[PDB]
Design a protein around this ligand. Sequence first.
Ligand SMILES: NC(=O)c1ccc[n+]([C@@H]2O[C@H](COP(=O)([O-])OP(=O)(O)OC[C@H]3O[C@@H](n4cnc5c(N)ncnc54)[C@H](O)[C@@H]3O)[C@@H](O)[C@H]2O)c1
Ligand SMILES: NC(=O)c1ccc[n+]([C@@H]2O[C@H](COP(=O)([O-])OP(=O)(O)OC[C@H]3O[C@@H](n4cnc5c(N)ncnc54)[C@H](O)[C@@H]3O)[C@@H](O)[C@H]2O)c1
Ligand SMILES: NC(=O)c1ccc[n+]([C@@H]2O[C@H](COP(=O)([O-])OP(=O)(O)OC[C@H]3O[C@@H](n4cnc5c(N)ncnc54)[C@H](O)[C@@H]3O)[C@@H](O)[C@H]2O)c1
Ligand SMILES: NC(=O)c1ccc[n+]([C@@H]2O[C@H](COP(=O)([O-])OP(=O)(O)OC[C@H]3O[C@@H](n4cnc5c(N)ncnc54)[C@H](O)[C@@H]3O)[C@@H](O)[C@H]2O)c1
Ligand SMILES: [Zn+2]
Ligand SMILES: [Zn+2]
Ligand SMILES: [Zn+2]
Ligand SMILES: [Zn+2]
Ligand SMILES: [Zn+2]
Ligand SMILES: [Zn+2]
Ligand SMILES: [Zn+2]
Ligand SMILES: [Zn+2]
Lengths: 345, 345, 345, 346
Amino acid sequence: MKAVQYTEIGSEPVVVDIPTPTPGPGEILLKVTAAGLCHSDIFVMDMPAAQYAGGLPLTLGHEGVGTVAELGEGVTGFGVGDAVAVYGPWGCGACHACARGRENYCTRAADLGITPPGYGSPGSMAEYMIVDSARHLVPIGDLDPVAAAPLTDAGLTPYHAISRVLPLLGPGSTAVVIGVGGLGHVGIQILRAVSAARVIAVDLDDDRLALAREVGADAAVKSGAGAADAIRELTGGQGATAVFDFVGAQSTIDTAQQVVAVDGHISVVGIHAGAHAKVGFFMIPFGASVVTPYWGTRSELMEVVALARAGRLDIHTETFTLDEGPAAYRRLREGSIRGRGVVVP
Amino acid sequence: MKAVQYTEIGSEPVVVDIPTPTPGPGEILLKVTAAGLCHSDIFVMDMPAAQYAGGLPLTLGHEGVGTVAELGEGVTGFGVGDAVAVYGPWGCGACHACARGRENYCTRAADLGITPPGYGSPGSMAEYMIVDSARHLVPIGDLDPVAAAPLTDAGLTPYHAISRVLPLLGPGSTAVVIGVGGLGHVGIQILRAVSAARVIAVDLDDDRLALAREVGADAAVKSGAGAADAIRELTGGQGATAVFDFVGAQSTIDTAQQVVAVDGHISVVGIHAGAHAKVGFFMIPFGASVVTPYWGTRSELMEVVALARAGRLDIHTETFTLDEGPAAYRRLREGSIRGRGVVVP
Amino acid sequence: MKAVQYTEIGSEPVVVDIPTPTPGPGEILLKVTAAGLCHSDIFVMDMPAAQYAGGLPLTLGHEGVGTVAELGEGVTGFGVGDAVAVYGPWGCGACHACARGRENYCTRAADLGITPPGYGSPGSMAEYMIVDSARHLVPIGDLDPVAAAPLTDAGLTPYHAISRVLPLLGPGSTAVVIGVGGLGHVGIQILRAVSAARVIAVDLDDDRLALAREVGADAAVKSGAGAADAIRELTGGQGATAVFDFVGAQSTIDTAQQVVAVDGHISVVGIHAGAHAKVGFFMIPFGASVVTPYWGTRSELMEVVALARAGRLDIHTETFTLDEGPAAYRRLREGSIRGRGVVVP
Amino acid sequence: MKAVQYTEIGSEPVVVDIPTPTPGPGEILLKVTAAGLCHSDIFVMDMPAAQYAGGLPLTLGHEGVGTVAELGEGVTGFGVGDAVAVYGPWGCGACHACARGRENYCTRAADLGITPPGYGSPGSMAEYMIVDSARHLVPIGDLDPVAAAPLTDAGLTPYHAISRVLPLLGPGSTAVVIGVGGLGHVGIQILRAVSAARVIAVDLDDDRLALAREVGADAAVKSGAGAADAIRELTGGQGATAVFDFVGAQSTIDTAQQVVAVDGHISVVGIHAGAHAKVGFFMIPFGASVVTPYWGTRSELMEVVALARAGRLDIHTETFTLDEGPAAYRRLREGSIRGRGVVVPT
Ligand SMILES: NC(=O)c1ccc[n+]([C@@H]2O[C@H](COP(=O)([O-])OP(=O)(O)OC[C@H]3O[C@@H](n4cnc5c(N)ncnc54)[C@H](O)[C@@H]3O)[C@@H](O)[C@H]2O)c1
Ligand SMILES: NC(=O)c1ccc[n+]([C@@H]2O[C@H](COP(=O)([O-])OP(=O)(O)OC[C@H]3O[C@@H](n4cnc5c(N)ncnc54)[C@H](O)[C@@H]3O)[C@@H](O)[C@H]2O)c1
Ligand SMILES: NC(=O)c1ccc[n+]([C@@H]2O[C@H](COP(=O)([O-])OP(=O)(O)OC[C@H]3O[C@@H](n4cnc5c(N)ncnc54)[C@H](O)[C@@H]3O)[C@@H](O)[C@H]2O)c1
Ligand SMILES: NC(=O)c1ccc[n+]([C@@H]2O[C@H](COP(=O)([O-])OP(=O)(O)OC[C@H]3O[C@@H](n4cnc5c(N)ncnc54)[C@H](O)[C@@H]3O)[C@@H](O)[C@H]2O)c1
Ligand SMILES: [Zn+2]
Ligand SMILES: [Zn+2]
Ligand SMILES: [Zn+2]
Ligand SMILES: [Zn+2]
Ligand SMILES: [Zn+2]
Ligand SMILES: [Zn+2]
Ligand SMILES: [Zn+2]
Ligand SMILES: [Zn+2]
């Protein structure tokens, strides 16, 4: 089968031909219908060899949807042909976090060598993929696969980040979304669906500010040195109840600390090596919590799928073939994908 | 009346003679029965003149209990002689935060010039004190005033900090308390009363580790370079669900980041100028939130008083006269008060 | 001044001429700009003399907006001319519930003889009205008074009912609204603004089912014997996550028990003498909680006002003069007001 | 193997000899070390034939602990000899409730024919038992099995009931526990461990009031017509923040409605056919919620085990052999077991 793989440190990924896998006991083989590209793939491919823990070669793609092609020995709960999304942050399934579906926060996965598809286990950027267990599949019914693939991370990750503090986001609240990319353009829409927060989008690119308004942001403002003042002009001196930073550069985290309200929240979702919030007296308002969330929970993925099925999420995509995979990653690097890139095998 | 006041920048506080105040409309005059000394008073007195916002002169003391001496015009809900604790973090009473009793997070207090007793308004370290409004008094009944004074901050502040994340502290959880001083020795006892957390206390001083065990800590660890490893030996590689840092030095915040669990919490309660948690990917576990909480809420103070009335709080105190006020602050500076210092006028 | 009063048991209310009141210390005199009629007024007027606790005569109206006309002695925080909504369920202000703004659940109001405007204290159906305290006023700015009056109860009560279980109403959930009257037509809109619940409205009257669709209900079902089956056809055998019963007749409560989901909720908001849910094994699903909520909290009223200011609430009204007050109550009795009746003095 | 079974409608359970089962793919065979008796077993055995859905014959026992004896095909995550408690309210594992561990509230179990051990599937009152899946086992380490068996229901059910409203139970709150039996005597102890609530116990039997005080109740009062006034004398006119009714008779539910506070809670945990709270205006205070909870969640069982491991739960038991199973059920019927009855297969 055709697949897109990261094969050597510092190089671009390449299209390869590798055997179509066979599902062992408990496993499910999916025929992949859509595979999302994520900026985390770029972060992973830019890690030095000392840090990189994905293994070589690695089939990329941690945003996967498909149809059940083959059931491994003893697998029940799905039939051949069922359309399914892959729950990505695989955990042990047995610890206190996993028992609540919070496999993203599994305390045993490292020790047991459990790694996610697309970063240690083979991903969805291939014609077929193996899923380890039935509990890592969620039905999507007749959802269009191209718009469904991003739900698994571009949807799930912002959904989790927002869910952590949703009780803060009542009528009268403001939520700032920094970075209107794959994650951010879905995060705006989640905020509008599950809260009455006023949503203010922030991006470097004027076309992405237009995208923000298209998907329901109440205002959209230019990122950089003037952003904090511009957000404060919109909120008055109260600031923003919550800031969801999907960039996570030092400059954006600084903007976040300069606009967050007393008893508010900053979610540092975007990943930039070394960047961090500085949480201390006189550097941040009283009561303003900060976290780096990771991916999301099993029940959250089901909720994201439910939002998509109800028509609440308009996922902006561009479609690529497997052969165009490497080219698509270059597009993502240069910032020329409006929304989410999706490979269709 | 006799009072203890901060009268010039960089100097020690002094005992003074100043007029006994008279309550205006809405105000209550208390005869003070006990006034707690807090390390925040030392922080305030060490601020350079540019930063210091308490006004000069300032009657110290933001931990106050007393008996109602005189009712100002139109005050109902209290009789002369009623024993009461003073709710300290005064707010506007009208904003969304204040309507929930969360006057510690009042968004209008700065703009309206509303300042707490002992830092902008006259404190409790005097024979009498004015309280601005009846909603800032909580009845204590027959509670001993000396042990009750610390409830207003040494009790309230840890109570608030713990309350922010109480749902995390289930059976099987661990809570670390760094700094077994006024706040910390009460925080251990709150944790034991309102959660099933295993409590690990951390202090530089072996006698304070003994105090920790006396008030119900399950374990005690010497602070400094070995603390993180020693806490991890006690928790296993999971780490501590929550860390309540009542020191807040860079070294203790670093220890906190090195031991906090995935999806855990660090509460940076203690104040050291410039110290901060560094909340960023690879610098803190996934999902581990961090906050600097401030004081507490009206309903929390009532709950703290209820804990004291139920016998759940053993407040360790040393008593001083008003004339001994300055000497007591020197004792607090040098770390020679075992628990909380309390002035009795 | 002109007012509408209930003056004898079993009779219709009458237009009267009574002195314009003068505000005592702490009180505020409002010039009333709009006064809502509520079906609770009919319930109150139909009570036998043994049960009725409103006093005679009673100025009706517990849904009041106005402009500040006169400040009583010592009142600050409002200026003459300020547009304000009246928080109705007056409490003592000092107990644990009141400290959290939850004066609807005040434990001391009965003992202290504190009664709400329109049921023990004089209501808003008059040219002027007294409010006991500044904390019972919430600013509305330039909101149209006619559409703002209903926010104080038709908005607040459903808002509170929904808020009690809002975490249940995630994507994929269903909320049933029984009774599309004053409260119910606002409840549909709150559900749409603060949750991703699919909303199914239930009413006896086809025109009210049309109103339900006009304000955003996803589906509409005829009430009565077929309603349970019709709701289940829409939800599948899972049933409805939450049922907000704004009728509260035995028949509607029975419908609610027949459609509620496992681990769901029934809020019995509407009042019919003797009607009750029967909460016991085999009579209701496992985990499905039931409550009779009362009015709402101070912070909730602020949130409702915030929803109105953001354009999320389209309040359907019909306007009446004070002279038409009694006629308007007859209209409400017969079910001929489409939404909320509002008296404008 | 020896087992205790319900074999015909209206009859007492009997000791039988039936084959030792073999685990199929995904299943685990446990050697049972302790099996708790629960009053729900009596409720089930008293159902008329039209209502009874447990199947015949039925090996009783939904409170089970054991050691892993045999792993079915493909089972990982447990070794032979591991000491484990059985999570009882089996669900589909795939629905929104099950994904959160809330298999007690599974929306698909009925449709798929998934039934719990001891009520549709074979229970733990036997020398061996099959568990359907590894996710229904929780490790207990070196916990004494006799005191551990009750954690699976006598612990889990009150724990769940309390957990639903734990944020209400702050300092200053009062929690009433009606019925100091298997569930109730553990519920008192959970309340003391996870909240600062003042605990008031209620029972018909003075010896059970003594038991209540022994395990940390702040007060213990006689059930029946005078109980509501006696509880109100202890709380003042505020009433009780929460009432956990582990009897669930109409009389106890009525007591609960008469003492619950405004914005409080009544958890109707005990099962009496036809009994119900009447939730309506003027019949209950404003804001006082009422629910019938069912069993508990996966993460809750882990928390209960953690409480036991920390020394927070003193489980009062009496031990019986498998041969004494039927006699033990008669003891439970007559109210003569002080705490929980536990069968230890030899
Ligand atoms: N926390 C997690 O679990 C997790 C999961 C998935 C992705 N991520 C991270 O989320 C981030 C976003 O991922 P993506 O796939 O949506 O990225 P993307 O490349 O689709 O979008 C990036 C967007 O950010 C904008 N942007 C870049 N720099 C900016 C700045 N300084 N100010 C404002 N806007 C700026 C761009 O203009 C673009 O619109 C990445 O860092 C990725 O690694 C985190
Ligand atoms: N966030 C707020 O709202 C708030 C409110 C009140 C007080 N505070 C602050 O909380 C802190 C504690 O106040 P307090 O009055 O309890 O102080 P205290 O002087 O009574 O206690 C100091 C204690 O900390 C210990 N300690 C000092 N350095 C240490 C280290 N590196 N590691 C471990 N232990 C150490 C000492 O041994 C002593 O036991 C102060 O910084 C104070 O300003 C904050
Ligand atoms: N719990 C509280 O604190 C609180 C507060 C305010 C009002 N209330 C109560 O809420 C209820 C609604 O008040 P309102 O002023 O909105 O009433 P309303 O007269 O404006 O509306 C009643 C609506 O219910 C419909 N209806 C009547 N019987 C029905 C049935 N069997 N099935 C379906 N629909 C039916 C009518 O067609 C109408 O659309 C009243 O009972 C009132 O006393 C309670
Ligand atoms: N909701 C659920 O998921 C669930 C789960 C397990 C058990 N249960 C039920 O909980 C109940 C308790 O089970 P158990 O095994 O602990 O029972 P048990 O037989 O051990 O306890 C009985 C106790 O209740 C007392 N009692 C009886 N009637 C009383 C009354 N009117 N007032 C006060 N006390 C009274 C007895 O004196 C005795 O102390 C049963 O009804 C059982 O079916 C429910
Ligand atoms: Zn990703
Ligand atoms: Zn795990
Ligand atoms: Zn202090
Ligand atoms: Zn305020
Ligand atoms: Zn009303
Ligand atoms: Zn009150
Ligand atoms: Zn049972
Ligand atoms: Zn299920």
